[PDB]
Each structure stands twice: as structure tokens, then as C-alpha cells.
RNA sequence: AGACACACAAAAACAAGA
């Protein structure tokens, strides 16, 4: 009895092959800070380096995190992991280069644009500010960038240049970050693998990386924290999802999650970096499961009601919301009657539970009205 | 049955890697006290050393704690722990340097600023005064700095220069301390690892470090001292938090706490020094748990009612406050009826308990009114 | 022959006392 359903899955197990071969060029320049400042000046003017973009951003990376040290960079875990991923790093000794145009190897638009010609930490932290809401688009991305700038200035950590706060500048930074994989990956690796010794700039990087965890993968968090639960008897299934309708869907989700598992420590950033198997965690491929999980999560988490969802999911999400609210009131009643001893703690615990549920209800309605207002202003635009 | 929920956690276990490579330069100068006084004069004038900042503050550190001894400094536990963290220490022999500008290796603003040109213990103790309230911002930071200066003058320990008490000077010191990791870490290490032999200055350092314990980590103290308790049967769960709503949240908090455990003796200063896993102890990631723990703590500790919290937490915190007050009156009634022997001690113990609860109620209301008044003046600003 | 659908969507520093 050969397994037929494996033909539904064999397309998602590449057995770890090697395809990538990118010629990323490294620069050894005595005027390291000078060329880095030139790169920053080029970027703030909205200049697209294209092919040179990877090299320039890697130069900024090595300057800020290794102080122009190449021996340690090429043996760093970033370098080894990109060895696995298929990135080639080679060093070019342009020691006497002073102008930015000297180091660059279809160049005509770039050359014509360049005719117009710890700040590195400022630039890298500003780029990292885009990570938490990078995949949601550009509107919310720049909104959260502005919020992060305001909160960081309020904490007194960093005071950014005023000109960087212009809408065009964040648009350029969003474009350059979305189009470049190396900037993302180095930022996430530095945020994740740093243990101690953070300055202000590395602290901002680490905070942005932590906020970027599971960005664009809300389905993963919702399903794992609101449907599949580990008890003392192993993993259990949510009572609301025992139907085959979503049972097969959960089986498919488990398959996709196991496929995503092989990526490793960077699995939470799979949507940010577009890793393999990320398209198998799509909302479209799990419509009912996504709607049910999001409804249950909204029932638990008040702030989760602010998520905007497609119009084909709203009714199911609201139904799951109401159902899960009822089952949770049921479960709190069961726990109160089961675990306690006498009537006094029954009454005080149930009064507290009623107050907490009322507070969550009010907060959920407020955030739902806020989401309605946001959709209204977006439609009016 | 592979563990799926490990994909929710693999991003927070770096397996102790090495990323940092900072070129911290050490200075061997015969005019050690002279260059240190020059550094102090530069700082009091609000001069930002930037790159030279780490070297200058390390020079002050080695002067005050080792009397310009480099052999013991480079083998000190600070040096070894920074070996692990990825700091490189190299010595430069600028023996004949007299002007501050001689020892410094984008320098133009710094050079132009420098054209305008046991006090070391005074400077270091003044900096350490900022540690207890460093992460709360600048307002409360300078307020507690002023309070500490007043109390230390009253004890007769130290009499600071009057010009250092100007608002601009504490602002500069707050900026220099917040932007520099090395100053923090050396201050905390000296405060923690000192056993005896404190002079006045090291005594101030140790007192500030002790007051800095768990700064910005009030959630940790509240959860560990008001929710999870060790009985003779191991750790127990608070009756108010047996709901799954916060049960999963406590599981996540336990995960984050275990992640923070690997840091070691500097775990209480994780928020101060921005260690790894500090962003996993966020209030946002544990809204209900943070509000409940803070409410319970306020019910126990009267002075804890003065904490300012976000507007989305106030109702839940007050509900937890009232509930915990009721459960504690319940528990005192149980203990009095259970552990005692006859009626006389029942009556006197219950009268004392009633008086104590009334006193705590009055103090909590007073501090709540004080917090209201503080918020009122802050809003009026 | 084939026939559909399928980016993302929220929140997220700290807060007292000593």
C-alpha cells in the first residue's frame, strides 16, 4: 500500500539543494568612514545603486559592526550561513578610491544620477525601524517608523536628522530595504545573535528585530497559541475545530509548519526574508482555519481586533469571536467551580472575572471602532 | 510527534555566539591624573567624545579603581567577561601627551568643540546616580539624581560642585550614560563584585547599583513575588491567574524568564544594559499578566500604587487590586482561625490586622492621589 | 485541454518607594 497523498507534498521538500550564486563584492578602503559617508549621502538623495547596492550596504554593515575588519566578517556566522545559502564574497582592494563612483564596476542612469553629488549607526537603525511592519505595505510601515522615531527620541536614545523624517526619505528607505535581502538578513542576524554589549544603535536594532518576530505570520501565532495546545497528555485540538472541514486544513497547516521548521532560528522572519515554504503558510490556502484562529485570538486578545482582513473572512471571524467568548465564559465557570474550596472565593473570583470580561469587551469594541474609522479614512482617500 | 511549538521559541536561543568586535583603545599616560582632569573638564562643558568616549571613560575607570594599573585591569573579570562579549582592548602609549586632543586618533566638529578648552570619584559617583532611574526617561532620572545628591549631602558623605547641579549638566550626563554601555557595565560590575574596602565613592557606586536592581523590570518582580510562589510542594500558581487567558501568558513569561536566566548575575540589570532577551520581557507581550501582577502587587505593597501605566491597563489593574485585597482579607481570616488557640489572640490579632489594612488603604489612596497630581502637572506642561 | 481562490493587515520603551 504505497502512500498516494505524498504526491500532494513532494513539491515542498527540496532536500536542501544549492542554487544561489551571487557575486557580492567586498571593498577594502583606507577611507572606510569617508566612503561610508559618501554612501549615506548617496542614499539620502534617493539614488538606487542597483547592483552596487549589496556591496555598499555590506560595507556599511562591516563598518558599523566590525570597524572595517574583514577577517572576522568572512568567518562570521553570517558568512557561513550565506555559504550554505549560496552567496559568494570576494574582496576588492580599492585603497586609493575617494569618489564613490571609483569603486563601482546599464550604468549610465546611475552615473548621471551620481553626477549630482556614528551616522552609519543612525542609517542602520533607521533602516531597522522598517522591519516590524515591512510586509504590511508602505502606509503602516512609515506610520510605525514615525512612531518608533518619536518613542526613541522620547527615551533620549537617539535624535535623528530632521530631513530623514520627510515622507520621501522613508519611502526611499522602504524601497531600498524591500528590494535588498542582505540588509534585512544582516539586521536580523545582528539583532538575534547579540548577547550583551549593545550600544544605543545595536539596542535599536535588537528592539526592531524583536518587534519583527513573526511579522506577516500572524496565522502561525494564532493557530499555535489558540488551537493546538500542549497538555500533560501531549498536544490537544481546540473543541471548535474538531470538524473535518478544518481538520484536513489543520493537517495541511501542520505540514506547512514542519516544512518551515527546517529553516531554523530565522523561521519567525520567514515572511520578512521570503524563505522557502513561506507561500505554504498563506491565508488563502487556509481560509477557514485562518478565520477561525483569528476569531479565537480576537476573543482572547483584545488588541487583535484591530487586524484588517479580507471581506470574505469577516463573518466567519466574528462568528468564531462570539463562539470563543462563550466557551471561555463557560471554561472560567468550570474552573471556578472546580478548583476552589468555599463560596467566598467563588464570589470574589467571579466578580473579578466579570469585571475583566467587561473591560476586554469595552476595549475590543473601541479598537473595532478604530479599525472601522481607519478603513473609512482609507476608503475616502 | 515532533514538537511544533518550538518554532514559536527557536528565535530566542542564540546558543551563545560571538558577534561583537569593538576596538576599545587603552591609554598609558604618565600624566594620568592630568588627562583624567582634562576629560572631566571636557565632559562638564557638554562635549560629546563619540568614538573617543569609550576610551576616555575607561581611562577614568582604570584611574579611579586601579590607580592607572593596566596589568590587573586587563585580567580583571570585567575584561574576561568582555572577552566573552566581544570587546577588544588594546593599549596605546601616548606618554608625552598633555593636551586632550593629542590622544584622539568626522573629527571636525569634535576638534572645533575642543578649541574652546579625587574629582574622578565625584564624576563616577555622579554618573552612577543616574542608574536607578535610567530607563524611565530623563524627568524622573534627574529628579532621583537630585534626591540622591540631597540625601548624600545630608549624610555628609560627599559635597558635589554646585555647577554640576544645573539642569544642563545632568542632561549631559544622562545622555552620555545612556549612549555608552561601557560606563554602565563597569559601574554595575564594581558595585556588585565589591565585597569590602568601600570608600565614600565606591559606597555611593554600590548603593546606586543596589537601587538599580531590576530597574525597568518591575514585571519580573511582580510576577515572581505575587503570582508564582514556592511552597513545600514546589511552585504554586496564584488562584486569580488559573484562567487559560493568562495561563498561556505565564507559560510565555516562564519561557522569557528562562531565556533571561543564561545572562547570569547581571540579569537584574538586563533593561539597564539591554541584554539579550530583554525585549521578550515586554509589557506589551504580556498585557493581561502585567496588569494582573501589578494590581496584586499594589494590593500587597502600598507604595506600588504610584506606578504610572498605560491607559489600556488601568481598569484591569484596579480590578486586580480590589480582588487581591478581598482574597488577602479572606486569607488572613483563614490563618487567624486556623493557627491560633483561643479567642483572646483571635480578637487582638484581628484588631491589629484591621488597623494594618486601614493604614495600607490610607497610604495607597494618598499615593494614588499623588500620582494623579503628578499626571496633572505633566499634562499641564 | 484547462477551468475557483490565494501579499500583508492589530498591539508592543519605561513608569512607585529606598
Numbering used by the authors:
A (entry chain B), B (entry chain A): 1 to 105, 109 to 120, 128 to 391
From the paper:
Marburg virus (MARV) is an enveloped, non-segmented, single-stranded negative-sense RNA (ssRNA -) virus that belongs to the Filoviridae family, order Mononegavirales, and causes lethal disease in humans and non-human primates. Therefore, research aimed at investigating the MARV proteome to validate antiviral targets and to decipher the structural aspects of its mechanism of infection stands as the utmost priority. Among the seven proteins encoded by the MARV genome, the nucleoprotein (NP) exerts its fundamental role in encapsidating ssRNA into a helical ribonucleoprotein (RNP) complex, which in turn serves as scaffold for nucleocapsid formation, viral RNA transcription, and replication. We determined by cryogenic electron microscopy (cryo-EM) the MARV helical ribonucleoprotein (RNP) complex structure in single-layered conformation, which differs from the previously reported structure of a double-layered helix.
To fill this knowledge gap, in this work we report the detailed structure of MARV RNP complex in a more compact single-layer conformation, reconstituted in vitro by assembling recombinant NP onto synthetic ssRNA, imaged by cryo-EM and determined by single particle analysis (SPA) helical reconstruction. In agreement with the results from 2D classification and 3D reconstruction, atomic modeling of the MARV RNP complex structure describes a single-stranded, left-handed (h -) hollow helix with inner and outer diameters of 164 Å and 285 Å, respectively. Each helix turn is completed by ~ 25 NP subunits, and repeats with a pitch of about 70 Å. Indeed, our structure revealed that an intra-chain, non-canonical parallel coiled-coil is formed in the MARV NPcore between the helices α15 and α16, stabilizing the C-lobe in an orientation that favors both clamping of the ssRNA by helix η6 and NPcore interaction with adjacent protomers via helix α16. Interactions between NPcore protomers and ssRNA are only intra-strand ones, established in such a way that any given hexameric RNAn is wrapped by the corresponding NPn protomer, but also interacts with the adjacent ones NPn+1 and NPn −1. Overall, binding of each NPcore protomer to a 6 nt-long tract of the 18 nt ssRNA in the asymmetric minimal unit of the single-layered MARV RNP complex follows the same modality, and involves the same set of highly conserved amino acid residues, as in the double-layered structure, with any hexameric RNAn tract being clamped by the NPn η6 and α17 C-lobe helices to accommodate, twisted in a “three-bases-in, three-bases-out” conformation, into the groove beneath the NPn N-lobe. Moreover, substantiating the rationale for a sequence-independent RNA-binding fashion, most interactions are electrostatics in character and established between the ssRNA phosphate backbone and basic amino acids such as Lys142, Lys153, Arg156 and Lys230, which were previously proven by mutagenesis as important - to various extent – for both RNP complex assembly and ssRNA synthesis.
